[PDB]
């Protein structure tokens, strides 16, 4: 039971965008990577604000009336606004389409970056299950789990214990 | 003993379109297209407009007797005019260069 | 008795969103007129929860 990011998201992760789930002797639970959530929240907020705040426009006017014998000038004004309508509409559509695809890729990179940090810490003291989870080859008590999530897990501390558990699997 | 890396999910029914996929469910979104108006005629940066009641702009400027007289110094951000004003040019005749005059008097300090 | 930064003849657009599909003509500090029905930016993640 309980799988990782390869098979989808977690409804139980409520205190952050990215996080971890653990299981050992002392229990189980979800825990968000607060710092990674912080860094991504700033990036998404900045992107939305940049798309919004950069629209610094000249004063808009509705004075577009010409006299009765100047219908050709009125048509020129009509097609000028048609041209800008086409320009803004097309650019706005593809802006949202492009950014939405990149935003989803941005979340995927952040999730993958947490997965790589844990993978390089555990090295061969754990087995990558291929579903976003790791099979710790040693007892990992609650202090050990916190060290992994804080980036302070020691490879050589559990190295001997993991080696004996690995040769049993072989 | 296991540790997993995962991400956030919820019950949001919101979907967004990407350049590669359509109707992708997302946990949160933000619209950048304003689709609603309050249906009111308002002040513009705290500057009141000029209400013509039922008079056309030439009628108000020239002083049609059925139109309110400008008794005091005033200012306006824009001029609001009825689509079919009741009181216009009461004495038949063309008002010259109305469009050019609008550029001068629509926004005054 | 209202105050807006953008005004149209059918209603005021009191919005700082960069785009609007309400009315072609307006006055003031206004969003750019577009014919798009929706412009929704994704901010969260792909909502594909495990079963």
């Amino acid at each position, epitope marked *: 039971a309980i799988a990782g990011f390869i098979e989808g998201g977690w409804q139980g992760l409520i*205190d952050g*965008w990215y996080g971890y789930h653990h299981q050992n002797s002392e229990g189980s*639970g*979800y825990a*968000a990577d*607060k710092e990674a*959530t*912080q860094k991504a*929240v700033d990036a998404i907020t900045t992107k939305v604000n940049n798309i919004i705040d950069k629209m610094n426009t000249q004063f808009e006017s509705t004075a577009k009336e010409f006299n009765k014998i100047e219908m050709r000038i009125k048509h020129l004004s009509d097609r000028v606004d048609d041209g800008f309508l086409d320009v803004w509409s097309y650019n706005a559509e593809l802006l949202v389409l492009l950014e939405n695809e990149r935003t989803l890729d941005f979340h995927d990179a952040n999730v993958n970056n947490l997965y790589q940090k844990v993978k390089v810490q555990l090295k061969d003291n754990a087995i990558d299950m291929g579903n976003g989870c790791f099979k710790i080859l040693h007892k990992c008590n609650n202090t050990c789990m916190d060290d992994i999530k804080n980036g302070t897990y020691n490879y050589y501390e559990y190295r001997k214990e993991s080696h004996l558990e690995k040769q049993k699997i072989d | 003993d296991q540790i997993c890396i995962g991400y956030h999910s919820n019950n949001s029914t919101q979907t967004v379109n990407t350049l590669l996929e359509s109707n992708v469910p997302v946990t*949160s979104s933000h619209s950048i297209l304003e689709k609603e108006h309050n249906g009111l005629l308002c002040k513009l940066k705290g500057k009141a407009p000029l209400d013509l009641i039922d008079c056309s702009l030439p009628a108000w400027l020239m002083g049609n007797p059925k139109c309110d007289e400008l008794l005091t110094a005033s200012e306006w951000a824009y001029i609001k005019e009825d689509p079919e004003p009741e009181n216009g040019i009461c004495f038949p005749g063309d008002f010259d260069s109305l469009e050019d005059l609008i550029l001068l008097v629509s926004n005054t300090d | 008795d209202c105050d807006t930064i953008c005004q149209t003849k059918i209603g005021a657009i009191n919005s700082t969103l960069p785009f609007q599909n309400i009315h072609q003509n307006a006055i003031g500090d206004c969003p750019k007129y577009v014919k798009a029905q929706e412009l929704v930016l994704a901010t969260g993640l792909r909502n594909n929860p495990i079963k």
Partner: antibody
Amino acid sequence: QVQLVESGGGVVQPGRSLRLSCAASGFPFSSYGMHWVRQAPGKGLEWVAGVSYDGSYKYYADSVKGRFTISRDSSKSTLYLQMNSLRPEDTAVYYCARPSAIFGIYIILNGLDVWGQGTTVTVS
Amino acid sequence: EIVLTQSPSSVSASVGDRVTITCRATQGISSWLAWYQQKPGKPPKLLIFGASSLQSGVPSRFSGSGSGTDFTLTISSLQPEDFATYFCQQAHSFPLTFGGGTKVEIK
């Protein structure tokens, strides 16, 4: 409708113990982390403790470490602060504060949008 | 510990004035700053989060700006009900820390 209610404060001799209670209503109390913030008379605001939504993770300021214990009751929607070995410098008005959520996630590190009236603890 | 230095410790002004209060951090806190308004005997009220975002139900005369180390809270046109003490709070990391405080008082 959404507001907290602190209780349990009072006059207490040095070295004694008190337990504060923060009764929450109007919002999903079990989704938010919670914090305790105290204010000495005439002084500024000092954060003392915080706890995650599920109670698994707890954070303490150095000034109350080893003496204060935060905790919560999911079924009662109540937050607790057990205060041991009380000192005159612990005298303050104690608030329970809710961190703000953003983008739909209840991040514990944020601004504090909801506070109670506070309860007064006087150590002398 | 991230320490927030608030300036000025106090200031006197009249109604309609423009009031500037600054908050300085020892290290980068990105956008995780908050501004609070506190009347005597009452709990603090959240005014600004994200160092610039206006909290729902707060007049638009309150504005915040800044990123990383230096932040500013501005009251464009003071009102009678704005005379209080104001605090800046960081939300970057534990422990949560507050500024020394700024009392806005009548002259």
